[PDB]
Amino acid sequence: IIKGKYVINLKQIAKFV
Amino acid sequence: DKTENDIKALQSIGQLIGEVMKELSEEKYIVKASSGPRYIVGVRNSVDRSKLKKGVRVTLDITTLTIMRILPRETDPLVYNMTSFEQGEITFDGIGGLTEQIRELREVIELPLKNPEIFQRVGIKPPKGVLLYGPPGTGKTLLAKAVAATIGANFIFSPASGIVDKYIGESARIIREMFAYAKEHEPCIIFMDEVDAIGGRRFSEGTSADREIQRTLMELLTQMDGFDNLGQTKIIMATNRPDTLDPALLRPGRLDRKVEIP
Amino acid sequence: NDKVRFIKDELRLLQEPGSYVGEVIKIVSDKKVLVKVQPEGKYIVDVAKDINVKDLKASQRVCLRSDSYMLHKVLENKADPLVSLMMVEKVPDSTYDMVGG
Amino acid sequence: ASDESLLRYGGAFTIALAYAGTGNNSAVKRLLHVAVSDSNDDVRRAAVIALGFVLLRDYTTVPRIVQLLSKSHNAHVRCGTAFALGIACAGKGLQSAIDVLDPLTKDPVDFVRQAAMIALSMILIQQTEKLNPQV
Amino acid sequence: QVFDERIKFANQLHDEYLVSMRYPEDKKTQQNEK
Amino acid sequence: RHLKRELKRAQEEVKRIQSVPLVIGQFLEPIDQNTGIVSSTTGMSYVVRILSTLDRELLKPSMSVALHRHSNALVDILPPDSDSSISVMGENEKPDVTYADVGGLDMQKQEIREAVELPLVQADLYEQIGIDPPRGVLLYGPPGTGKTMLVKAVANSTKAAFIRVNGSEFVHKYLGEGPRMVRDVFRLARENAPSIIFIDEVDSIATKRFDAQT
Amino acid sequence: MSLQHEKVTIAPLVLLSALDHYERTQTKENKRCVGVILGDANSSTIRVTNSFALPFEEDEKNSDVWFLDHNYIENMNEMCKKINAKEKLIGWYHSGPKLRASDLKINELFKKYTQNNPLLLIVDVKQQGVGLPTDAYVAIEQVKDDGTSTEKTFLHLPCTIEAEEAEEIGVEHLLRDVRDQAAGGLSIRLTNQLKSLKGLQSKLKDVVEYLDKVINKELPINHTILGKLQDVFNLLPNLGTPDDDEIDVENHDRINISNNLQKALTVKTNDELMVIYISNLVRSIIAFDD
Amino acid sequence: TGRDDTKETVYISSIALLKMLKHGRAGVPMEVMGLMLGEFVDDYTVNVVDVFAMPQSGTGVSVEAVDDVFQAKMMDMLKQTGRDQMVVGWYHSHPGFGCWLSSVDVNTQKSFEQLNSRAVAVVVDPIQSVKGKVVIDAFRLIDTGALINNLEPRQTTSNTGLLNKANIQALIHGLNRHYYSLNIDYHKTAKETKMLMNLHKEQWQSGLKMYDYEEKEESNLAATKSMVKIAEQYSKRIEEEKELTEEELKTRYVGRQDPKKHLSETADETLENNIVSVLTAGVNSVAIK
Amino acid sequence: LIETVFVKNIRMLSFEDISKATHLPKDNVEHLVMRAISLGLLKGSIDQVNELVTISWVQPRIISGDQITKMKDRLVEWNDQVEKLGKKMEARGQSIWV
Amino acid sequence: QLPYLVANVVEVMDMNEIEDKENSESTTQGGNVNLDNTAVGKAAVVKTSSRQTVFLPMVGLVDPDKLKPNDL
Ligand SMILES: Nc1ncnc2c1ncn2[C@@H]1O[C@H](COP(=O)(O)OP(=O)(O)OP(=O)(O)O)[C@@H](O)[C@H]1O
Ligand SMILES: Nc1ncnc2c1ncn2[C@@H]1O[C@H](COP(=O)(O)OP(=O)(O)OP(=O)(O)O)[C@@H](O)[C@H]1O
Ligand SMILES: [Mg+2]
Ligand SMILES: [Mg+2]
C-alpha cells in the first residue's frame, strides 16, 4: 500500500501497479 | 529541456540482448537470446565480423532482429551488493596478539598479489586457497574485512545463503558468473562468509534440498581445478566448524593453506 | 508447369498457425476427446470428420490444429510405457546357446 | 498498350468482335499473346474467353489450343478456359471439349468449378441421356 | 580454340538428344493404351 | 519461355522464407518426407510441413534446424556442426597439463592407453582381431588422487579433439533447455570423429536415489 | 558549418511524396515546389526519412522574387516532432528540372534553422533519364585559384538510395516487375552487358564535345573538371604487359570449367534419353492388352 | 436500399502503404494509430491518398487517445497547401495479434462511423511484413441492430464474392459475423512506377563492374569439388533401383533426396555465371585500351 | 621528367632520351628519378637492366591551353573505339536481348 | 498513469553523452561520422519479472542518482 496506488504481484508471477 | 529529453526517450524503443553463440556463415549468426531460445539474426554495417566473437553480449532488435552494436558483458544485480559491503573496516591490525596468524594469511594472499616473481624463483605454483576455521567470535571475519580494506584488492564476498536461490540453474549461474567477474577484476579475493549451507555431504536420502546443495557443489569443483585455473583469484573460506564439510571441500591445492585462529 | 506450380503451391502450404502434438488421455462419449498437449495441460476438444472416438484411444498421439486444438489426424506414432522402463534399464534377450553348460 | 487493367480487359474483346467468326491467325495470335505475357489475372482471363468468338466458324481445333492453358494452375486462366470451350463448342457437342472441362469441374478452386458446370451445358445443350450416357 | 571445338562436340550432342527423345514418346501416347 | 521466367520469380519468392529472422527448434523424427515432428525450444511441439529440395539425410535423425518465426514451419535446415552447446575445447584450447606431472599412476596408465588412445590411432585394430571395443571410462576415487590430471596428461599426448563440458553446462535454466544441450555435444563429436567427450563430474547429474515426487 | 554529406541515402517514400505534393499544388509551366526535408544528420550518410510541403509561390517575371512562409515552418516541425523525435530540418527539396543560382539565396535562408549544412535535393518530377531522378547538392563556401573571392556554389553529391526493412517490402508488395536494369538470369545479364557499355559510350561523347565548347565557345575553365580526366589517363589499363598474359591464362581457366560442365550435363540428359525409350517398351505391352 | 450498400474496396495509394508501415514499424511493440485521408467516389470506391499519424499514448490505442487538437491542427497545415481532402477512416496496428479488431477498437469504429459512415479501420501488421508479403486487412463494422434486421447479404451484393480470412475460431468469429471485410488493391500511375523501378546511376552500368579474380577462382574451385561428391552419391543410386514399384525403389536406394536433380542444378548454375565472366573480361580489356 | 611522361601516351622512357634532354650522365638520371620518387612528384620503378624508367603515376598539375588539346584527342579515340565495338555486340547474340 | 511493469535494474553501464562528432559510445563501432546514427546516450539494463533483460535507453528525467545497480 502506497499512501496518497498499490503494488500487486499476480499469480502469473508478474508485478504491476 | 527536462521534459524535451523525455520526449526523445519515450519515442525510443527497447532492445533485446543475446550473445554470439556460434558463427553460422558470414552474415548469419546464431545467437542465444536472453529470452532463451536461439535465433538467427543479421548484421548492420555498424558491427564488423572481427568485433563479434563468441561470448560477447550483443544487442538485438525486437522487430528486425539484427545486431546493431556490441555491448559489454552482463553482470548480476546481486554481486554489486557484495562489492559495496565491506563496512566494518579496520586497519592492518584487526587483532592484537594473534598477529602471527595475520602475517601468515598475507603469505598466501598478499604476497603473490604484489610479486608473482618471487614465486617464480622458487618454482612453486603461485599460492592460493585458504580455509579459515576455529572457535566462534575470534576475528576470522573481521580479518576478512581487514585484508579487503588494507590491500584494497577487488573483493567480493558471498554469504553462504544469499547465493542460494529458489530457481535451479540460477544458483549455479551466480557463482559461475562470479568467477568470471574475478578474471577481469584485478587480483580478486573471494570471501565466503560463514559457509555451512552447501558444506553438506552427499546426503540425498533426506529432502530435495540436499540435491540442491549437490548441484551447486559440483559447480565449484570444476572452477577450482580444471582448464580453468586461477592464480590472481584467491579463495578465503570462513567457517565456524570445518568437520561439517564435504571432504572435497577440504581438498588441498584448492585450499592450500589451512589457517586456524584459536 | 508442374514444377513452377508446385513451388507456388508450397508457399501457401508452409504457412501455418502452429499445429501441435497431443496425446489422448481418454475419450468422453459426448463426441469429445480429452487431450493432454504434451508441453501443456488438458483440454476437451471436438474432432474432425475424418476421425471419431472409436478411431482414437488412450496413449495414442494425435495431431491438433492449434487455434481450437481441433483434431486433424491420428498421428503415425504411438507411445508405449513398458518399453520406457525396459529400455532405460537396457537388458537383451537370449537363447539357450548363450547359457549352455 | 494501356497499362490500366480496365482498358486491357476490353482490349481482348475488340479483337474478338472485330474478327468474330473469322479464320484469321492474327486475330487468334494476338489473344494467345495476352494470356501468357500479362501479369494481371483478370487480363489473363479475358484473353482466353475471347478465343471462342473468333473461332465460332471453326471450333474443332479449339480444345487443343486451350488444352495448354488448362494445364496452368492459375484460377483465372483455368476459369477463362472453361468459358472459351463453352462458347466455341456449343450446340452439338465435341468429345475433346467435354474432356478438357472435366478436371475443371472438380477443381479445388470455386471460380473454376462455377465456370465449368455452365460451359458443359452449352456443349451438351438439350441432348438426351438415352443418346449419350455421359450427359 | 581447342576448348571451343570440344564445346561444339558437346553442343552437337545436346541437339541430337533433344529432337529424338520426345519423338517415339509422341507416337506412343497417340496410340491407344489403358 | 514465360514459364521459365516465372519459375525464376517463384524460386526467388521461396528464398525469402528461407531467410532471417528464424527461430531454432529440434527435429525429433519424421512421419513423412514432407511432414515432420519438431520440438521448438519455445517449449512447444509442432507437426510441420517440410520444404522440398532440402536434403533430409542429416535431418531425419535428430539435429538442429531452422523454423520460421510466426508461422512455425520447417523452411530450412542447419548443419550439425554449428549450434553446438559448446565448441571444441581441444583445438581452440589446449590441455594445460602434460605427462610431466605424471610420474607414478602407472597402474592406470596401462589401462587408459588401452581405453582412450587405441581407438583414436586406429579403431580397426580391435575389429580385425575380433575383439569388440570397450565403451566409456569411469574414473572414481577421491578427487585428490589426480583422476583429471591423468585426463589432461594423455589428452596433451594423443592430441585428438577434446570436449570440455560439465553438468552446469547441461543444466536447465528454462523449459526444454537441458535435453537440447545433451544432444548437441555428441552430434559435434561424430562430425569431427574421432573425439573424446569429457564430463568432469556426473555426481549431481546421476544419483543412486531419487524422489521424483516433485 | 561542416561537410558530412558524403553519402545521401534517400527513402523511396520521399520521392513518391514529392510527386504527390507537386501535383496537388498543380505547379506547372515552370512553377516550382519547395518542401522541407526532415531526417537525420551528424552522420556521414544523410538519411532522408520524410518531407512536407511548405507554401511557396515562385514568380514568373523573375527568378529572384518569391514568397515563402517562415512562420509555417516551425508549426510543421513541432507536429512531426510528436510523431518521431529524430526528425529535424536537414534541407529543402527543389522540384525544378535542373539547378538554379537563385536557389543559393534560399539555401542561405534555411541555414538558419539547420545545425547542419543545408541539403538541396533537386527532386526531378520529370523522371528524366533511366538512372536516378535525384541529383543532390549542398551549398558550400570556397575560394578558388582564379582570383575569385568568397564564392558560394553547389558541389554535386553522389546520390544513393536506401530503404528500411518495412519500407522495402512495401515496394515489393506494390510491384511485381522484373526490371530492364536487372542482373538476373543469363539473358538478363546479356542485356545488362550491352546496356552498361552503351551507357559509358554516351557520357564519353558529351565530354568530347564539352571540351570543344571551352576552347572555341568560351565556356569556363575549371581545375576540378580537368583534374578528373587526368586521373583517367594515368590509371588507364595496359595490354601486352605481363598483366595481360595472366588475364588470358585466367581466361582459359574459366573456359575450362565451362567445358567440363558442358560435358557433365550431356550425361544426365542422355540418361533421360534412354529412360523415355524404356518406358515406351513397357507401354507397348500395355497397349496390346488394351 | 436505393444504393449499392456495400463496403468500399479500399485502394491504397503508392505513398500510403509505405507510410503506414514506416509509421507502425518504429513503434513496435507498442500499438500505433493515425488517420487515413482520402476521397469518396462511387458507392464502393474509396481511394486513400495520404495518411497522418495521431501521436502516441501511454495506454496505446483508445478512443481517448484521439486528440482533436492534433487532428485539426495538422489538418490546417495541409489546408494551406491544398493537399487535405476529408477523413475517410483511420489505421492502427495490432502487431501482437492477427488481423482483426480488438474489443476496444470496435467501439472506436462506432464513434468514427457516427461521424462518417464510410469510416474504415485498417489493421497493419508491421511485424509480419518481414516476409515477402505484407499482411494488411480492412474492416468496417456492421451494426448489431443491423444483424437483427439481417441486412448482411445486402453488403455482399455485386461483389466477386472473394473475401479474406485470418485464423480460426476467435479471429474468424469477429471477422465475418460482426464486421465486414473487403479486399485491398494498390493504385499507381506510370510516373510512380518509373520512380520505384529506377535504381542507382551505376546500376545500369554495373555489368562493366567486374569482381576481384580471387573471388571468381573461389567460385571455380568450389563448384568442381562439390560435384565430385554428389556424383558419388549418384553412382550408388543407379546400381539398384530396377525392380518394381518406383516409389519403393526411390525410398530404398536413395532416389528421394534426388542427386540426379541436384547435380544438374549446380552444373547449370555455375555454367551460366562463367559465360558472362568470360564475356566481361573480353570486353573490358579490348574496350578501354 | 614530369613533363615528358605526361604529354606522351607512352609511360616508359629509355635513359637515352632523358640523358639528351636534361644534359645529364646516366649516373644522374638515376638520382633524378630517385628524387622524384622520394618527394612524391612521380612514382614508379626502374629497370637499369632494360635501361628504362617505367613511370606508373604522374602528379596532377595545372593544365594549359596546349594540354587540353592533347587530352581531348585521347578521349575521341576511346569514344570511337567503344562505338565500333558495340556494333559487333549488337550483332552477336541477336536472338536474345530479352 | 497505470498500469506499468515493476522491475529491478541489472546495471547502469552508461554510454558517453551526446555532444561528439564521431560516435558517442564507449564501445568502438565500424565506420565513421556518427552521433545519432547507431550512437546512443546513457544506458540502463533492466531485468523484468516476466523474466528477460532489455537494453533500453534510460529516460532523461530519471537520474543516475535515482538509479542504483539494484534499484526497484
Ligand atoms: N578481536 C576483535 N576485537 C574487537 N572487535 C572484535 C573482534 N573480533 C570481533 N569483534 C567484534 O565482534 C563483531 C562480530 O564478530 P565477527 O562477525 O567479525 O566474527 P566471527 O569470528 O566470524 O564470528 P561470526 O561469523 O559467527 O560472527 C565485530 O563486528 C566486532 O565489533
Ligand atoms: N601424479 C601427479 N603428478 C603431478 N601432479 C598431480 C598428480 N596427481 C594430481 N596432481 C595434481 O593435483 C591436482 C588435481 O588433479 P586433477 O586436476 O586431476 O583433479 P580431480 O582429482 O579430478 O578433482 P575434481 O574432479 O574433484 O575436480 C592437480 O593440480 C594435479 O596436477
Ligand atoms: Mg562471520
Ligand atoms: Mg577434476
Residue numbers in the entry:
A (entry chain H): 105 to 108, 144 to 156
B (entry chain L): 89 to 350
C (entry chain J): 52 to 152
D (entry chain N): 541 to 675
E (entry chain S): 459 to 492
F (entry chain K): 73 to 286
G (entry chain U): 1 to 290
H (entry chain V): 18 to 306
What does the paper say about this structure?
The proteasome is the most complex protease known, the primary ubiquitin-dependent protease in eukaryotic cells, and a well-established target of anti-cancer drugs. Ubiquitinated substrates are first recognized by the 19-subunit proteasome regulatory particle (RP), then translocated through a channel into the proteasome core particle (CP) to be degraded. In budding yeast, two deubiquitinating enzymes reside on the proteasome: Rpn11, an integral subunit of the RP, and Ubp6 (whose mammalian ortholog is USP14), a nonstoichiometric factor that binds the RP reversibly.
Among assembly-proficient mutants, two were almost completely defective in activation of wild-type Ubp6: rpt1-S164R T166K and rpt1-S164A T166K. The S164R T166K double mutant (hereafter rpt1-RK), which has lost ~97% of its capacity to activate Ubp6, was chosen for further analysis. Rpt1-RK proteasomes appeared to be inherently unable to activate Ubp6, and not simply attenuated in Ubp6-proteasome affinity, as the catalytic defect could not be overcome by adding elevated levels of Ubp6 to the reaction. The Rpt1-RK mutant proteasome was indistinguishable from wild-type when tested in a degradation assay with Ubn-NCB1 as substrate and no Ubp6 present, exemplifying the specific nature of this mutant. However, the mutant restored substrate degradation in the presence of Ubp6. Cryo-EM analysis of the Rpt1-RK proteasome together with wild-type Ubp6 and UbVS revealed that the fraction of proteasomes in the si state was reduced to ~25%, whereas the conformational profile of the Rpt1-RK proteasome alone was comparable to that of wild-type proteasomes. Thus, the Rpt1 mutation impairs the Ubp6-dependent transition of the proteasome to the si state, although Ubp6-UbVS remains docked at Rpt1 in the s2 state proteasomes that are observed with the mutant. Release of the proteasome from the si state may account for the recovery of protein degradation by the mutant.
